[PDB]
Amino acid sequence: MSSKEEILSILEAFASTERMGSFFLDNATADFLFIRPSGNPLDAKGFENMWSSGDLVLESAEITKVHKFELLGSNAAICVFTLGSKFTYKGTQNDDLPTVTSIFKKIDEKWKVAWMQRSSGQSDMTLW
Amino acid sequence: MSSKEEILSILEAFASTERMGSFFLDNATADFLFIRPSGNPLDAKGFENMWSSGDLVLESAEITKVHKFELLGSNAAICVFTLGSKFTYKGTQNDDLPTVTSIFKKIDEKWKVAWMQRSSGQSDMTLW
């Protein structure tokens, strides 16, 4: 299957209620970081720690729209997408709609997420 | 010279008081977008329009620290950095310190910026 499809399969797994929290632990490269809207990095364990809280629960997440996909040579790729989520935090439901830039690399012939930066969650879809 | 150095030379030109506004017009690929902290995209002209305002003036900008650099094959690259700027907006000076994820591609044997997403400007350097 096409690399878009392979990489999209990985992003769908990230955007899943059961798998998001621990995902980077299994699927990310060792030097992966997740860049929060503040600019402050989290590593795979830091990301999982956020979701481990108890106070933060993912209700739904989806790959709403892919804005950019391309291979960067044979063994890397960029995928830019809008991630649409619903989550509960300390007693309130929230919608979240960031723009996310993700980078993938092939390691031992398998695709892994190498980098991800997200925006604040009130993006305007109409601009795409 | 090394690709880091070539790509760093391009980023220094972006982070310059005279060149930032119009930079993407000359140095970016046609499908480049700049992702604002909100997640909302700007194209090269949209970016220049912001700086054309009169109300917004860049006083200084620097590549403060490079956190990640690597080639993605022979003809692409990722560079993650903290951009330290001072700017005036509608009568007030501000400091700005985002995390920026940039992607580069070689087009006709020349490096061009292909993508850039920035965070809010109050990142915590101590986390790197």
The topology under which CATH files domain B2-128 is Nuclear Transport Factor 2; Chain: A, (3.10.450)
- Kindly state the tokens that stand for A19: 């798998």
Domain boundaries, chain A: 2-128
Q: Hey, is the C-beta of B51 within 8 angstroms of any chain A C-beta?
A: no
Residue B23: what residue type?
F
Q: Hey, is the C-beta of B126 within 8 angstroms of any chain A C-beta?
A: no
- For residue B113, which residues of chain A lie inside 8 Å, CB to CB? none
- Substitution target in B69, B71, B117 with the highest count of A β-carbons within 10 Å is B117
Cβ atoms of residues A97 and B113 within 8 Å: no
Torsion sign, CA atoms A82, B47, B20, B110: positive
Cβ atoms of residues A74 and A67 within 8 Å: no
B116: closest CA among A35, A85, A23?
A35
Structural biology method used? X-ray
- For residue B82, which residues of chain A lie inside 8 Å, CB to CB? 39
Burial class (CB in 10 A: 0-12, 13-18, 19+), A67: middle
| Contact map slice: A 88-117 vs B, CB within 8 A | 97-99, 101, 103, 105, 114-115, 117
Q: Hey, is the C-beta of B37 within 8 angstroms of any chain A C-beta?
A: yes
